[PDB]
């Protein structure tokens, strides 16, 4: 019954969905079989797109304070529910096992056998090539959608206008159907409005890759429908 | 804004629902205008009164530990949703530990002999209180909860 640590707030709407998913992925008869966690939810962590492209405040210092507070009660597994913030992964300061969502997600993708995927992520995640670097040695066709449209959809999710976010991303998805075999959800806002049943296209969800790792580290059980994520 | 503290985990689904309510009640056009909090979610704190009486147990230690932890972060206000509220008078705290029942009662008498669940949500009363203490803004559609 180990307590795990979660860093969230990036953004708040996506974090709620992340915690919901973590709960729903857990195989629990009784309430005590669910994950014990401390969520450090700091939405005043500086905007990660402005940090990356516009020389504004890096999220590193705020994230590091969260890690420090989680580690102060002996939490030794922490996950951060934000793809884009992993651009700064080497600058985080931690003593614990700070999970890497990009690695876990890439490992899931490599295991799955999917050869052609639609990368749905922020523009910083695309530009930084953080997924490109991890997949380059694995022979996987990664298709980049229109970044203006995807970023518009992400913004709508962020203000919990899920209706406009769906309407916005729909033609992007449907337009790429013929050249991808799966959707790679690599922005935590995307799972708020997209699952496999949404478009009837397989999904590799970075939320679920991280959640599965946290569930395992918490000593809990993963539901078998999420077998793909059992790394 | 100030970081605030939340104790939850009893049960896990209700906790997610509470934090979703907190988020959707906050008036914010950008992420950085939302509420900063630390949520201590412990599903191993028993949810049934039968369990406590049977095993000569009490959630006082688990809640008090959570409180010490949140306070060690520098948190000045802590809210708990929920069965552990039965032991509210025995919790040990330095900070302001909000009482969900009094927040609820005062919302009622502020603009209004109630049917125990024209809709008042006990969750939203606590949420409103936490949003205020976090130095954040409450969406107008929740006027009724603004203490």
From TrEMBL, chain A:
It comes from the Archaea. It is an enzyme of class 5 (isomerase). Keywords: Isomerase. The keyword Flavoprotein does not apply. One of its GO terms (molecular function) is aspartate racemase activity. Its EC number is 5.1.1.13. Pfam families: Asp_Glu_race. PANTHER family: ASPARTATE-GLUTAMATE RACEMASE FAMILY (PTHR21198:SF7), GLUTAMATE RACEMASE (PTHR21198). Belongs to the aspartate/glutamate racemases family. This is Aspartate racemase.
